Amino acid sequence: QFLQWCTLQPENCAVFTSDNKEMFQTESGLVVSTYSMVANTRNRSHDSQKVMDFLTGREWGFIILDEVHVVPAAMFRRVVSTIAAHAKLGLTATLVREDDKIGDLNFLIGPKLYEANWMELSQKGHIANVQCAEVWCPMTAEFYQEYLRETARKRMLLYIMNPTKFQACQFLIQYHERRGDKIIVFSDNVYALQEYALKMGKPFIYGSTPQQERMNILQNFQYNDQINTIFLSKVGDTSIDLPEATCLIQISSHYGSRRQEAQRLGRILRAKRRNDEGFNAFFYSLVSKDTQEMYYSTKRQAFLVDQGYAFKVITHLHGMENIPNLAYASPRERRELLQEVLLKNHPLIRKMY
Amino acid sequence: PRKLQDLGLKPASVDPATIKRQITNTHMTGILKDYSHR
Amino acid sequence: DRPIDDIVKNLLKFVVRGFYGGSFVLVLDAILFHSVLAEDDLKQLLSINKTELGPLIARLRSDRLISIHKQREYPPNSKSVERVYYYVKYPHAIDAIKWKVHQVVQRLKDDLDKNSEPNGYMCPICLTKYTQLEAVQLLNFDRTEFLCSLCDEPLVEDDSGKKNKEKQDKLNRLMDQIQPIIDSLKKIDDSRIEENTFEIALARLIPPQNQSHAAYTYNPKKGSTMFRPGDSAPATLHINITTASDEVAQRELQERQAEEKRKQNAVPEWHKQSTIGKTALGREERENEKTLNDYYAALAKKQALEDEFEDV
Ligand SMILES: [Mg+2]
Ligand SMILES: [Zn+2]
C-alpha cells in the first residue's frame, strides 16, 4: 500500500522481517517491521543485532503502530521506549481488550484523537453492511450425555464438533456457495478446523502452514472460480485484506475475547462490491444451545452491539432438511464420531553398514 | 565493408563479427491452480 | 514483393551479362529465376557437365555473386550425403559490385594520370626501366647519352608519349557504358535491403524438377551451439443476423439473466421472517378469410497416414 499510494522510491524502503534484514543506508527512509523483531531483548543474532544498533543510534521522527491494541502488552510496550521518535501514531479498528490495560495507551502513545462511527461510514458507502446472525444449534442427546460428566478442559472439544453444527455449517456454506459468495470459515480450535476440512474436502490454514503455502491457497481462493471457500484460523484474524470476502462463518472461537469477534467481522467489511444495490454481507456465529458457548457468545459480541450492529437469532434454517446429504445423518456415523472424539484424550567401517 | 566507408561509399553489408547470437492440506492434490500473478 | 528486389535483380543481370562470358549468364540466371538451387538440379537445367559447371561456380563464388550452403541430409531410403545449394546474397553481391566498379574506374584514372607524366627510359639489353631521376645520374662523362649500369650501353626512350588521348578515350567509353550500374546503385542506396539466408531464400523457391533428390528444406539441428563462418546474417469474425423471432429470443435471454442477476444479492428466507416459532434444524377464422379473399377477388374482378496433428 505504501508504494502504490505515495511516491516513495523503493530505494529508501527496507523491510525487517525473518526473511530479509538489510537496512537502508540512504540518509532517510522507512522500516516496516514487526513488534516481535523490535521487542526481542534476550537473543538477537549478528544479522539482527546490526539492525538494532542502526535503529537505536539514529534519532527517528515518526512511528506508526498498526493494530495498536496490543502495544501495552508486557514487552511489546518496550519498543515505544527503546525506539526514539518525536511523534507516535496508533491505528487499531478495535480499542478494547479483556484486561484493564487498555487505558494505559494514554501515556504509552498519547490520548485518543478521533473516533469514526461505524454506522455513519456504512450508510455513506465507505464500508459494507453486515447482517449479523447467531444460529442456535441444539446438541444431540447422545453427545450431551457426555457433556454433563466431561470436565471443562475437554468440554470445549466435546461441543465444538457436535453433529448439529456440522449440518448448519455445511448447509450454510452450500447455500452461500450457490449464491456465489466468497466464504471464510474461522475456527480457533485447530483440531476442529482439521476435522471440518478433511471431511468437507476444502483447504484449511493454521499456524503450522508456511507463508508460501498459505499465500498460494489465498491467491487461489481469490482469483480462481473453482475455489470459493477457505478455512482460516486465528492467524488471519487481524490486518488481512480480503476484498472478495462477503460471507463469514464462525463454528467456534476464542472464549470471551471481544476484539476477536469484531476484528474477524472486519474481514467481510472489506467487500469490494459494497456499493451495489441490495448487497448485504453475511456474518454467522454458530453456537451450541445449552452450553457455555452461549455465555461466551453473548459476552464476545458485546462490542458490536455498542457500535450499532444487531445480532439476529436463527432457531432453524428453512429448506435444510431437503438437502440431499448431511454430515453424520445416520446414528451409526454419529456414534463413530462420539467414540473418536471421546478417545482423543571410520571410513573402513562405513562399508559394512 | 570497412574499406567502402573509408572511400565514402555506403556499404550494404556488416562485419559478421558484429552479429550477436540471441505445506498442509494435501487432500486437494490437483484442485489448486497456480494463480500466482493476478 | 518489393520494387527494390527487381532493381537488385536487374543490376545482377546486367553485371553478369556484360562482365562475364555466356555460360555465366545461364548459371546466374537459373539461380535468379529460382531460389536456392541444388547442384544436381542446376546441372540438368543447363545440361552442362560437372567439369564445365566448376569454373562457372568457382568464379562466381570468388566474386561473391553466389553464396554456398552445405547441410547434412538423411534420405529415408539411402545413406546420408552432404548436399550443396547455391543462392544470391544481395548485400554480398552489391558490396562486391560496388568495390569492383570503383577499383576499375580508379585504376583507369590512376593509369590516365600516370600516362601524363614524362615517358622515362629503358635499356634494350637488360630491359631495366629507368626513371628520369634515375637516368640522370647514370649519364656518361661526355654527358651526351645515358648509360646503363648493368650493360654500360646507351638507353632508349620509352613509349606511351602518344597515349595521352587514347587513355582519355578509354575512360570516356567505360563511364558511358557502365552508366546503368551507377543508376541502379543510386536507387539501391536510397532503399534498404534485407540480407538473404538459405532459409529465407527458400520462401521464394520455384522447384526446378518434379522429383528432385535434394530436399529443399532447412531443418537446423536442435539446440546446436556450433557456429560456422559466414553462416549467420543480421482472429476470426462471425456474424449472426438477428430477426424478429431472434430479437425477442435475445430479450428473453436478457430477461432471464436479469432475473438471475438479482438473486446473488437477494436476502434469504431465514433473514426475511423472524423464525422463533418454527421447529429445530438438523436430521372459423380461416373460412371467414377465404370467403373474404374470394369476395375481394370478386370485387377486383367486378371492378376490373497417421501423424501428430492439431485442429486449426
Ligand atoms: Mg489495516
Ligand atoms: Zn642494361
Swiss-Prot record, chain A:
UniProt miscellaneous comment: Present with 825 molecules/cell in log phase SD medium.
Entry similarity comment: Belongs to the helicase family. RAD25/XPB subfamily.
Domain Helicase ATP-binding: residue ranges: 1-113
Known function: ATP-dependent DNA translocase. Component of the general transcription and DNA repair factor IIH (TFIIH) core complex. When complexed to CDK-activating kinase (CAK), involved in RNA transcription by RNA polymerase II. May have 3'-5' helicase activity alone, the TFIIH core however has no 3'-5' helicase activity. Also involved in transcription-coupled nucleotide excision repair (NER) of damaged DNA. In NER, TFIIH acts by opening DNA around the lesion to allow the excision of the damaged oligonucleotide and its replacement by a new DNA fragment.
Residues that bear Phosphoserine: 330
Result of knocking out the encoding gene: Essential, it cannot be deleted; epistasis studies suggest it is involved in damaged DNA excision repair.
Taxonomic lineage: Eukaryota, Fungi, Dikarya, Ascomycota, Saccharomycotina
Motif window: DEAH box: 66-69
Identification of the protein by name: General transcription and DNA repair factor IIH helicase/translocase subunit XPB/SSL2
Quaternary state and interactors: Component of the 7-subunit TFIIH core complex composed of XPB/SSL2, XPD/RAD3, SSL1, TFB1, TFB2, TFB4 and TFB5, which is active in NER. The core complex associates with the 3-subunit CTD-kinase module TFIIK composed of CCL1, KIN28 and TFB3 to form the 10-subunit holoenzyme (holo-TFIIH) active in transcription. An additionnal subunit, TFB6, plays a role in the dissociation of the SSL2 helicase from TFIIH after transcription initiation. Interacts directly with TFB6.
Domain (Helicase C-terminal): residue spans on this chain: 167-321
Highest taxon, organism lineage: Eukaryota
Location of this chain's protein in the cell: Nucleus
Curated annotation (Swiss-Prot), chain B:
Coiled coil: none
Compartment annotation: Nucleus
Note: Present with 1150 molecules/cell in log phase SD medium.
Family: Belongs to the TFIIE beta subunit family.
Role, per record: Recruits TFIIH to the initiation complex and stimulates the RNA polymerase II C-terminal domain kinase and DNA-dependent ATPase activities of TFIIH. Both TFIIH and TFIIE are required for promoter clearance by RNA polymerase.
Quaternary context: TFIIE is a tetramer of two alpha (TFA1) and two beta (TFA2) subunits.
Name of the protein: Transcription initiation factor IIE subunit beta
Swiss-Prot record, chain C:
Any GO BP annotation: transcription by RNA polymerase II
Alphabetized Pfam families for the sequence: TFIIE_alpha (PF02002)
SMART domains linked to this entry: TFIIE (SM00531)
ZnF (C4-type) residues: 123-151
Intracellular or extracellular location(s): Nucleus
Record-linked InterPro entries: TFE, TFIIE/TFIIEa_HTH, TFIIE_asu, TFIIEa/SarR/Rpc3_HTH_dom, Znf_RING/FYVE/PHD
Cited PROSITE patterns: HTH_TFE_IIE
Superkingdom of source: Eukaryota
Keywords from the UniProt entry: Metal-binding, Nucleus, Transcription, Transcription regulation, Zinc, Zinc-finger
Positions with biased composition (Basic and acidic residues): 251-263
Residue span, HTH TFE/IIEalpha-type domain: 8-98
One function term, GO molecular function aspect: RNA polymerase II complex binding
Region (Disordered): 251-272
Gene Ontology cellular-component terms listed: mitochondrion; nucleus; transcription factor TFIIE complex; transcription preinitiation complex
Family, as annotated: Belongs to the TFIIE alpha subunit family.
Note: Present with 35900 molecules/cell in log phase SD medium.
Purpose of the protein: Recruits TFIIH to the initiation complex and stimulates the RNA polymerase II C-terminal domain kinase and DNA-dependent ATPase activities of TFIIH. Both TFIIH and TFIIE are required for promoter clearance by RNA polymerase.
Subunit structure: TFIIE is a tetramer of two alpha (TFA1) and two beta (TFA2) subunits.
Record protein name field: Transcription initiation factor IIE subunit alpha
Name of encoding gene: TFA1
